[PDB]
């Protein structure tokens, strides 16, 4: 038979294993002859193993490297302009690599040129808050100095963008080991952690959706039109470089004015934490001087595109996308999920060679330049943008398929939450102590939902991934699946090593997952979910799941403007629309499943999946959310305040934030109403979808 | 059998003419009390006709009316401040129609309030190029002066723009007999010509396809969030009144300043035609003063929407629209279409006694509040726009049947080029010296093709009616049809008692259509078409006419912006991507059209007719035109200079248009580059639709 469990069974750890050490030998940077050799190869075998039409789809990005032979560091500089200390120039290399080139070496990518000098204020992680308590309650002001932040909570470009608001001059991004050294590990190559020499790389852009910074709302094929650079999308105004924390104690150690305001601001470094501005007495007279030269230059970047034709439905398309460029190696980030998709093809083509098909087309991608801004997949999306809207069932994302060894972890639409229980109910829990059990089972007793008893915790899509343009621009249903660390322990990295040079083949073989058992299970999870998306007759995404969703972030946000009654009262503020239209879809979709269970007619179904296809898309407003356009879902959107994280009724959320300080409450309040009808309209018209169509 | 014969034979001009009759006893303003009960009328007939459901679909949107205490009107005024002629307060009413209430006084809906006293100049038609002759050519400064203007050749809300973007202070508009009295027809009641006390009613807004000027984006229901009156969409900063050619003598005879610059400058009146400012010597002291008084108030309005379900594809929608609400009695503008509507539905929903159903969906419309901006047909699409842009098959506008009785005039996609053509072969021509001849031959005959031996004129779509929501913001294949006068023979109106207290019932009966024999015509195209798109088993669109069209337009375009040949070798301005892409267009359409002739299988088939009916909504930009973000159609807009007509590559066309006059000529040929970049994506884009899906 040629069903799931057939598809399932065919994956093996070890050709995970093998592919995962093939990827992961030599860097694979964007826009590199390497990753475009990689990018060839992948091309080979999807159609060796069978996949119907294997292409690559290239574009002309804009993208960010270092200068060979003028190399960026911090220094701290004396009265006489003397360099007294500088910052490393290269991450020390690890044991067998020692001789591999083209190790890029730790930058921002994006940083603007510039040598600034000034006076040292520590930020923190660098949040919305933080600085809200540099500036509101330490009254310190950051504006002319060079700010330095610890990495961590929130996505590096929002900690930029915070920093240049602020009126800094110039960040320093550093690793603490509060954040990225887990107690009683020990320092790659001998376990886990981060080493004082390590440095996370990153992009600190702030696209909001928008791909390549010279040419938002188009891909950028051979004739595009480019914006000029000045007019370009998300790029910072001062220089960033990240750094390691043996540089950091060096920069922190002299750190003079006031005392951090407490304890959430110290991390593990023997410093005092002090927030500034500049050095203690002795050293007043010193600063801190930032050489950066990287240079921004459009490059061509390749994504691998398969397919695989459906047998009845060719034109519905369910996407199995991650990307392959990576910061060096890539051993978890993102090679780890691009091996899974790998075995994932070659299991797909042996069903294929068998005579079998999928009921809807399966497209594979490998995107490229996604540690650049997510920009292969948008691209290819702006390009493809009438194809995915009116044929697009799902899109399934493949980063890396480990970031712990513990339990599951999933972030979805809740279209997808029965079809996910339903499929880990169905395959077996990897870990120690429940051989035997099923997925569920493990993943509910380590990860229970807070809201349920018995149910596993399933979160919203946020951003930082390729899942972007497909979810909040096209409204396209997402998901992905990974394995993950402990949260409940602390909320520290259960991968310190990204972004670094440690991130190697040898990282996961030796302290993550030795049998390759984690990858399988995420292997089965994601190809498991593409099975049934592109195979069951009836799409598997219950609304019912939506409409409960939706009451919760009701809830949610009614409960945030509740903290403001007198406004509420004096600008006439009421959620009483949303509540009725949360309502009406709740009643809607309960009859509408009733029709899905009890109507051989194939005209009937298609309309049903239709129903079922567009219920995701009908969240999308055209008009976008305020200052965003390319984020257009109205239930969800990556948060304002940090791209990874995902925030429920975002255009509503955003007007209430910090209203408080607004200087117009009349004007701030109009805009929470206007949020609201537009919400409250979009939910029923979502409903409305549902209803009978005539 | 039912057959389209069938639906055809049912139709009868008596109907048409007994219910154009009912129509039309009493104004039936938008907003008003009467105009809601002929709804209900009309909700209550065409349930009784046989629709499946018939539901009123209500809006509170921005309307404008005189205040009945406080007329508006002009006068001149002499030094001492004496008012010593005055415009009229009323037409007078026709015979027989002296005593009915209600009839509006004319008016422009939502002029502002104010009382604007000045020197008077003459700007023509007050078009783009009678403001660049003023200004550039003949030096004359508009600015602090009151702007008189003839009404004729571009939607006067263009006029009014223009007219407040030169300076003027308030807008005078008159009807002109050159333009709006046919040589040798007597005034009304004894012709069909405007007497010298008629005045066209008519909104002056520039809306852009915004509908409710206070919600855009939005329906304008029970909980909306309004802009303030500062900030809605379209409204005039200046008075404006409309005065008929008695009262404009009065106003133009003093008048002084220049002489006319050329004949085309001269109306019939026996006036110079002096563009002034200001009257001649012994009158130099006298001006013209504005007093207009009108109010704008949210008002609720109400559409008629009737369904007939589909029986074998329920979830795909055929539309026919057109609105009820008129300025006065409405005796052609929109009755004589509301007319044929009502009748189109009695013979569908004959047909649906007797057993059939059409195989898709129809969509009956009775729109209202269309001559306040489309307001009703706009509100609803915003409200139902997910529905529309998944489920809409073509959009056909059924406003005046007739506007002359010479030929047949059809506005429509180049998707329905084909359907046109033949449904018109199958049709009897009604004109004298064609009987036993098809309405192909009588048409092809009196309105020939330009590029085309043996074919008829079909026009490009523009706006300035209901279906502007439906083809331009949505991107749903559109059509409208009517009979019309020989615009070979002079360009002036077929009509010019339109929107006066004279365009009546006997207007029609004694001078257009005794018979009711046009009107029946235009009732079986607009039926006929409606029941092929509704029932034909592959949607009777071909792709191929589009490829054609796109063709002509970009030779169109690159000859504009051939006339400035150093400019383009200088910023290496290329139309090389927008031709290739229109070849791959050709391309691709001839080979879809040869496996849409090649392919029992029902998948394939609505595969096929679901390209077919998201092809003309592949040229959607969801970014729109530059600041006018609700017409994103890029090959076809209303023109910024003239709401009526359609321009073809809207986006280049504008950038091209007097760009010799920009003061920047890298940063204008910068944006003409980036437009060609934006339609070559497009079009590609379209083309590609229509490739193998997988
Ligand atoms: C959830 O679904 C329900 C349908 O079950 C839907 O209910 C609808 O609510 C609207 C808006 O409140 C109702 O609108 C009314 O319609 C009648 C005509 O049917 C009008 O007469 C009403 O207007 C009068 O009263 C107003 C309110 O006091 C006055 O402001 C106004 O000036 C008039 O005096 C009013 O417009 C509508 O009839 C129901 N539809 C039903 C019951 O079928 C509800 O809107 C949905 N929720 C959302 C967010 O869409
Ligand atoms: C109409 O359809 C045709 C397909 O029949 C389509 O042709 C495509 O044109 C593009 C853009 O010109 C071609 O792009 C090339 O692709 C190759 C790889 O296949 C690259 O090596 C090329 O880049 C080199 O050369 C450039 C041009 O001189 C340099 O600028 C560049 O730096 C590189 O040196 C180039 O990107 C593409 O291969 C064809 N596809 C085919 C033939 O299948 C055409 O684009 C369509 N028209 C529109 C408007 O879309
Ligand atoms: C996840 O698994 C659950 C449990 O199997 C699925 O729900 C079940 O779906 C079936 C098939 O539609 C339902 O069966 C129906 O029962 C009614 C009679 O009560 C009948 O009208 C139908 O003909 C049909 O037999 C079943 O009730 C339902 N069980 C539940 C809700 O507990 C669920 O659909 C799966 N989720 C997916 C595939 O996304
Ligand atoms: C308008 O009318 C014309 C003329 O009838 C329609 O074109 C005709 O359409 C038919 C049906 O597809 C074509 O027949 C086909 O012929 C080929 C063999 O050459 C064969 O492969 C098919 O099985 C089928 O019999 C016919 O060729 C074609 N005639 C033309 C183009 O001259 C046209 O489709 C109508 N337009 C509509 C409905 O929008
Ligand atoms: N362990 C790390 C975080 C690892 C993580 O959460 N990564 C994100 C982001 O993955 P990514 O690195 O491939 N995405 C890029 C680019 C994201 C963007 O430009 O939107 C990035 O975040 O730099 C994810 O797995 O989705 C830490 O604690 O700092
Ligand atoms: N005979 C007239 C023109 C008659 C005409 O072309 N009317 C247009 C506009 O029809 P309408 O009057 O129903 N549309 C309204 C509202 C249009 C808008 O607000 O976009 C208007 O033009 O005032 C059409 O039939 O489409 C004349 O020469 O001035
Ligand atoms: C990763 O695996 C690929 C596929 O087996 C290897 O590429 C092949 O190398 C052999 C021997 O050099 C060639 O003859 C083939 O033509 C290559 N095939 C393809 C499809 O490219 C590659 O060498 C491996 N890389 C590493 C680092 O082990
Ligand atoms: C990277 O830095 C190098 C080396 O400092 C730059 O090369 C110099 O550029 C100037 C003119 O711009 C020349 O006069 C120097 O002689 C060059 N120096 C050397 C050592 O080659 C180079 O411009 C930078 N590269 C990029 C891409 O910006
Ligand atoms: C940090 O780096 C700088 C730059 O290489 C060093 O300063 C240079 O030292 C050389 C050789 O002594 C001088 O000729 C250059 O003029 C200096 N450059 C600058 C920009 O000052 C500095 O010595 C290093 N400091 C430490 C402690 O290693
Ligand atoms: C237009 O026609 C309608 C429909 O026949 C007339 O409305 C009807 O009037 C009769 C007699 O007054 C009533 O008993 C019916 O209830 C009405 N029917 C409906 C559906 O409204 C209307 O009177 C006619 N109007 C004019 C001006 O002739
Ligand atoms: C229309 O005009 C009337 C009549 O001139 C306005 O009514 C006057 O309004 C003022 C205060 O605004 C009163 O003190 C006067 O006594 C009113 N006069 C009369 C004769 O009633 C009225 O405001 C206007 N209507 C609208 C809708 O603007
Ligand atoms: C034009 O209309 C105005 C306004 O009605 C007339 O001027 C008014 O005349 C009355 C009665 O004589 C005066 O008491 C008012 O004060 C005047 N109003 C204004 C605004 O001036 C005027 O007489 C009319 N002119 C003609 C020629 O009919
Ligand atoms: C911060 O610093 C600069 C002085 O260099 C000043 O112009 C700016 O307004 C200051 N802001 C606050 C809030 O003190
Ligand atoms: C793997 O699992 C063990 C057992 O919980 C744990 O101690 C170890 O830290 C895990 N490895 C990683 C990289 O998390
Ligand atoms: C037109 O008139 C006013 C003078 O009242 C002036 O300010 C404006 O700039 C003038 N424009 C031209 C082009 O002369
Ligand atoms: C009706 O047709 C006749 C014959 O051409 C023509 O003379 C007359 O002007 C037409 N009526 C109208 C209103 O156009
Ligand atoms: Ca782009
Ligand atoms: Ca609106
Ligand atoms: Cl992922
Ligand atoms: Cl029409
Ligand atoms: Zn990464
Ligand atoms: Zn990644
Ligand atoms: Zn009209
Ligand atoms: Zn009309």
Same mark, same amino acid.
């Given at each position: 038979?040629?069903?799931?469990?057939?598809?399932?069974?065919?994956?093996?750890?070890?050709?995970?294993?093998?592919?995962?050490?093939?990827?992961?030998?030599?860097?694979?940077?964007?826009?590199?002859?390497?990753?475009?050799?990689?990018?060839?190869?992948?091309?080979?075998?999807?159609?060796? !193993?069978?996949?119907?039409?294997?292409?690559?789809?290239?574009?002309?990005?804009?993208?960010?490297? @270092?200068?060979?032979?003028? @190399?960026?560091?911090?220094?701290?500089?004396?009265?006489?302009?003397?360099?007294? !200390?500088?910052?490393?120039?290269?991450?020390?290399?690890?044991?067998?690599?020692?001789?591999?080139?083209?190790?890029?070496?730790?930058?921002?990518?994006?940083?603007?040129?510039?040598?600034?000098?000034?006076?040292?204020?520590?930020?923190?992680?660098?949040?919305?808050?933080?600085?809200?308590?540099?500036?509101?309650?330490?009254?310190?002001?950051?504006?002319?100095?060079?700010?330095?932040?610890?990495?961590?909570?929130?996505? /590096?470009?929002?900690?930029?963008?915070?920093?240049?608001?602020?009126?800094?001059?110039?960040?320093?991004?550093?690793?603490?080991?509060?954040?990225?050294?887990?107690?009683?590990?020990?320092?790659? @190559?001998?376990?886990?952690?981060?080493?004082?020499?390590?440095?996370?790389?990153?992009? +600190?852009?702030?696209?909001?959706?928008?791909?390549?910074?010279?040419?938002?709302?188009?891909?950028?094929?051979?004739?595009?039109?480019?914006?000029?650079?000045?007019?370009?999308?998300?790029?910072?105004? +001062? @220089?960033?470089?990240?750094?390691?924390?043996?540089?950091?104690?060096?920069?922190?150690?002299?750190?003079?004015?006031?005392?951090?305001?407490?304890?959430?601001?110290?991390?593990?470094?023997?410093?005092?934490?002090?927030?500034?501005?500049?050095?203690?007495?002795?050293?007043?007279?010193?600063?801190?001087?930032?050489?950066?030269?990287?240079?921004?230059?459009?490059?061509?970047?390749?994504?691998?595109?398969?397919?695989?034709?459906?047998?009845?439905?060719?034109? /519905?398309?369910?996407?199995?996308?991650?990307?392959?460029?990576?910061?060096? $190696?890539?051993?978890?980030?993102?090679?780890?999920?691009?091996?899974?998709?790998?075995?994932?093809?070659?299991? !797909?083509?042996?069903?294929?060679?068998?005579?079998?098909?999928?009921?809807?087309?399966?497209?594979?991608?490998?995107?490229?330049?996604?540690?650049?801004?997510?920009?292969?997949?948008?691209?290819?999306?702006?390009?493809?943008?009438?194809?995915?809207?009116?044929?697009?069932?799902?899109?399934?994302?493949?980063?890396?398929?480990?970031?712990?060894?513990?339990?599951?972890?999933?972030?979805?639409?809740?279209?997808? *939450?029965?079809?996910?229980?339903?499929?880990?109910?169905?395959?077996?829990?990897?870990?120690?102590?429940?051989?035997?059990?099923?997925?569920?089972?493990?993943?509910?007793?380590?990860?229970?939902?807070?809201?349920?008893?018995?149910?596993?915790?399933?979160?919203?899509?946020?951003?930082?991934?390729?899942?972007?343009?497909?979810?909040?621009?096209?409204?396209?249903?997402?998901?992905?699946?990974?394995?993950?660390?402990?949260?409940?322990?602390?909320?520290?990295?259960?991968?310190?090593?990204?972004?670094?040079?440690?991130?190697?083949?040898?990282?996961?073989?030796?302290?993550?997952?030795?049998?390759?058992?984690?990858?399988?299970?995420?292997?089965?999870?994601?190809?498991?979910?593409?099975?049934?998306?592109?195979?069951?007759?009836?799409?598997?995404?219950?609304? /019912?799941?939506?409409?409960?969703?939706?009451?919760?972030?009701?809830?949610?946000?009614?409960?945030?403007?509740?903290?403001?009654?007198?406004?509420?009262?004096?600008?006439?503020?009421?959620?009483?629309?949303?509540?009725?239209?949360?309502?009406?879809?709740?009643? +809607?979709?309960?009859? !509408?499943?009733?029709?899905?269970?009890? $109507?051989?007619?194939?005209?009937?179904?298609?309309?049903?999946?239709?129903?079922?296809?567009?219920?995701?898309?009908?969240?999308?407003?055209?008009?976008?959310?305020?200052?965003?356009?390319?984020?257009?879902?109205?239930?969800?959107?990556?948060?304002?305040?940090?791209?990874?994280?995902?925030?429920?009724?975002?255009?509503? *959320?955003?007007?209430?934030?910090?209203?408080?300080?607004?200087?117009?409450?009349?004007?701030?309040?109009?805009?929470?109403?206007?949020?609201?009808?537009?919400?409250?309209?979009?939910?029923?018209?979502?409903?409305?979808?549902?209803?009978?169509?005539?």
């Amino acid at each position: 038979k040629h069903n799931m469990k057939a598809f399932l069974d065919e994956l093996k750890a070890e050709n995970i294993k093998k592919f995962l050490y093939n990827f992961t030998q030599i860097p694979h940077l964007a826009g590199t002859e390497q990753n475009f050799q990689l990018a060839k190869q992948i091309q080979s075998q999807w159609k060796e !193993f069978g996949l119907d039409s294997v292409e690559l789809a290239h574009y002309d990005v804009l993208l960010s490297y @270092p200068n060979k032979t003028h @190399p960026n560091y911090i220094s701290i500089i004396n009265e006489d302009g003397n360099e007294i !200390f500088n910052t490393s120039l290269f991450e020390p290399p690890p044991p067998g690599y020692e001789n591999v080139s083209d190790i890029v070496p730790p930058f921002s990518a994006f940083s603007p040129q510039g040598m600034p000098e000034g006076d040292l204020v520590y930020v923190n992680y660098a949040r919305t808050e933080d600085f809200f308590k540099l500036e509101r309650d330490m009254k310190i002001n950051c504006s002319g100095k060079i700010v330095i932040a610890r990495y961590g909570k929130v996505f /590096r470009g929002n900690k930029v963008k915070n920093a240049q608001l602020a009126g800094a001059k110039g960040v320093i991004l550093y690793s603490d080991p509060a954040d990225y050294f887990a107690p009683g590990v020990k320092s790659y @190559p001998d376990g886990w952690n981060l080493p004082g020499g390590g440095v996370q790389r990153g992009n +600190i852009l702030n696209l909001n959706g928008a791909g390549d910074p010279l040419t938002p709302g188009y891909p950028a094929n051979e004739y595009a039109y480019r914006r000029g650079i000045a007019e370009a999308v998300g790029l910072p105004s +001062i @220089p960033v470089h990240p750094i390691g924390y043996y540089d950091a104690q060096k920069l922190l150690e002299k750190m003079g004015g006031s005392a951090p305001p407490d304890s959430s601001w110290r991390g593990s470094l023997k410093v005092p934490y002090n927030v500034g501005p500049g050095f203690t007495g002795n050293f007043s007279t010193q600063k801190v001087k930032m050489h950066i030269h990287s240079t921004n230059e459009v490059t061509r970047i390749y994504n691998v595109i398969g397919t695989l034709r459906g047998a009845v439905e060719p034109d /519905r398309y369910v996407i199995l996308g991650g990307h392959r460029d990576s910061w060096v $190696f890539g051993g978890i980030d993102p090679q780890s999920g691009a091996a899974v998709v790998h075995e994932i093809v070659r299991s !797909f083509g042996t069903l294929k060679k068998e005579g079998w098909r999928p009921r809807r087309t399966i497209l594979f991608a490998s995107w490229d330049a996604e540690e650049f801004g997510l920009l292969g997949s948008t691209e290819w999306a702006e390009e493809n943008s009438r194809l995915l809207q009116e044929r697009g069932v799902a899109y399934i994302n493949a980063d890396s398929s480990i970031e712990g060894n513990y339990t599951l972890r999933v972030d979805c639409t809740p279209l997808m *939450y029965s079809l996910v229980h339903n499929l880990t109910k169905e395959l077996k829990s990897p870990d120690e102590g429940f051989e035997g059990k099923s997925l569920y089972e493990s993943w509910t007793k380590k990860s229970p939902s807070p809201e349920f008893s018995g149910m596993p915790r399933i979160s919203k899509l946020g951003s930082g991934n390729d899942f972007e343009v497909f979810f909040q621009r096209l409204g396209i249903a997402s998901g992905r699946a990974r394995y993950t660390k402990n949260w409940e322990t602390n909320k520290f990295s259960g991968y310190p090593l990204y972004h670094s040079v440690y991130e190697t083949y040898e990282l996961v073989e030796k302290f993550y997952d030795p049998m390759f058992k984690y990858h399988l299970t995420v292997a089965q999870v994601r190809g498991g979910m593409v099975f049934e998306l592109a195979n069951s007759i009836v799409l598997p995404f219950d609304c /019912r799941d939506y409409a409960v969703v939706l009451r919760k972030y009701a809830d949610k946000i009614y409960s945030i403007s509740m903290k403001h009654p007198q406004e509420m009262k004096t600008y006439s503020v009421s959620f009483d629309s949303l509540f009725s239209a949360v309502k009406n879809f709740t009643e +809607i979709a309960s009859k !509408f499943s009733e029709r899905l269970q009890d $109507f051989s007619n194939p005209i009937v179904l298609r309309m049903m999946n239709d129903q079922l296809m567009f219920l995701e898309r009908a969240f999308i407003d055209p008009l976008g959310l305020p200052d965003r356009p390319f984020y257009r879902h109205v239930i969800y959107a990556p948060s304002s305040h940090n791209k990874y994280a995902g925030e429920s009724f975002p255009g509503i *959320y955003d007007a209430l934030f910090d209203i408080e300080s607004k200087v117009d409450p009349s004007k701030a309040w109009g805009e929470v109403k206007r949020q609201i009808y537009v919400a409250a309209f979009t939910v029923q018209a979502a409903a409305e979808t549902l209803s009978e169509v005539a």
